[model samples]
Target: LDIRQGPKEPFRDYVDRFYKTLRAEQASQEVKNWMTETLLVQNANPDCKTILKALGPGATLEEMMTACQG
Candidate 1:
């Protein structure tokens, strides 16, 4: 089954849930990459969204994490 978050779920919680779902669905690495980027871009918290702009095309997961961390 695909993983979905509750509308009011916290961003961190949703990210956790997405990880589990990614495994359960046997998703590809590319799928994980794009989905992870998409979630960060549209995260529930407004402050989280700006990381997307910093993360241009071809940015690695680690790059996104580092950008978001700051």
Candidate 2:
């Protein structure tokens, strides 16, 4: 993905978010299990991952999820 600025920049934003969420969830046993069971490679979506990763430490999951719809 060429996640540059403007319309395409949001992609990069999302990727940032997903990385945040992934890192946050990584600390939780349940979340890790959920990631393995539900968000596996086969089920992985770039956009979704982007949002997930953004939910990391001090990040806003609600804000990220809302942006996913925008």
Candidate 3:
């Protein structure tokens, strides 16, 4: 669910619902960690590898940046 949807404040609402659905689905701790490390810990700016290293704790987060934005 690489969603970039809704307008301004509604974007927050969209993400909130996304997380709620995940929680309802009994998502694993690994999946939760993966999502946060993959998605939430990024700069909107394009130098995403540097941003992830500077921001997140996992190598997968850097890979996620490259996969999504590179």
Candidate with the greatest lDDT versus the true structure: 1
Cα lDDT tens digits for candidate 3, 1-70: 5543332323334446557766876879898777666554432224433455564466553354454442
Q: Which candidate order results from sorting by lDDT in descending order? A: 1, 3, 2
The reply for model 1, stretches above 4 Å from the true place, is: 1-14
What TM-score, to 2 decimals, does candidate 2 have? 0.26
Q: Rate the local accuracy (lDDT) of all candidates.
A: 0.60, 0.46, 0.51
User: Model 2, stretches more than 4 Å misplaced?
Assistant: 1-9, 27-70
Prediction-by-prediction clash tally: 0, 15, 0
lDDT of 1 by residue, 1-70 (tens): 2444455555456567668777776879888877776764565345545554666777765665555453
- Which candidate has the highest TM-score of all? 1
lDDT of 2 at 39: 41
Candidate 3 Cα errors over 4 Å, as ranges:
2-7, 10-14, 40-54, 58-70
RMSD of each predicted structure: 4.1, 10.8, 7.9
